[PDB]
Amino acid sequence: HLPKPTLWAEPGSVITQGSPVTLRCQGTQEYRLYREKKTAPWITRIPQELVKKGQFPIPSITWEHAGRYRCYYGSDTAGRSESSDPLELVVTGAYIKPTLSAQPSPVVNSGGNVTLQCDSQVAFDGFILCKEGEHPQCLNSQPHARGSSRAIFSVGPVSPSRRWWYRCYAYDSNSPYEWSLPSDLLELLVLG
């Protein structure tokens, strides 16, 4: 037991509240999953039959599941691996959904850049723009690009052969792993 194992989530690490997700660790059988800063009791309730296979399913995720997780195998007694890279499990749907629009239009010419605006009716110190992959690439708004209840993002160059699907979220930095309901899906339509 030496090499740090791999920790991941299926279908992904950004899950809508109430939906299922399975955290998985792979390195032989003595897997140990844990949440940083605050213990996560659900882990202790996973049947050993699944733990031995590095499977930690969450049938219906709740706000309480959100957090930064790591995994390792072995033990102090028998020796243990380094902890895996961190997995930030995010649960969405905690706040009113923001509005995401393309400036000046969702319809853009190939090779161009477009400005996306995520607007909220309630103040939030955090804004995230996620490009729905095909895992989705989620990025925090830049310091220079966010107001008290709004954030701007610049995407591009765009091309017709690639898909441009986005959704944004607002959140409170004191609970960085709990996001708002997602904004309606924004689909950029690249002419050409």
Curated annotation (Swiss-Prot):
Contains 4 copies of a cytoplasmic motif that is referred to as the immunoreceptor tyrosine-based inhibitor motif (ITIM). This motif is involved in modulation of cellular responses. The phosphorylated ITIM motif can bind the SH2 domain of several SH2-containing phosphatases. It is found in: Cell membrane. The chain holds residues 25 to 221 of 650 of the full protein. Disulfide bonds join 25-71, 118-168, 130-138. This is Leukocyte immunoglobulin-like receptor subfamily B member 1. Coiled coil: none annotated. The gene is LILRB1. Residues 3-88, 89-192 form the Ig-like C2-type domain. Expressed in B cells, monocytes and various dendritic cell (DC) subsets including myeloid, plasmacytoid and tolerogenic DCs (at protein level). Expressed in decidual macrophages (at protein level). Expressed in decidual NK cells (at protein level). Phosphorylated on tyrosine residues. Dephosphorylated by PTPN6. Receptor for class I MHC antigens. Recognizes a broad spectrum of HLA-A, HLA-B, HLA-C, HLA-G and HLA-F alleles. Receptor for H301/UL18, a human cytomegalovirus class I MHC homolog. Ligand binding results in inhibitory signals and down-regulation of the immune response. Engagement of LILRB1 present on natural killer cells or T-cells by class I MHC molecules protects the target cells from lysis. Interaction with HLA-B or HLA-E leads to inhibition of FCER1A signaling and serotonin release. Binds PTPN6 when phosphorylated. Binds FCER1A and FCGR1A. Interacts with human cytomegalovirus/HHV-5 protein UL18. Interacts with peptide-bound HLA-G-B2M complex. Interacts with peptide-bound HLA-F-B2M complex but not with peptide-free HLA-F open conformer. It does not probe the peptide sequence directly.
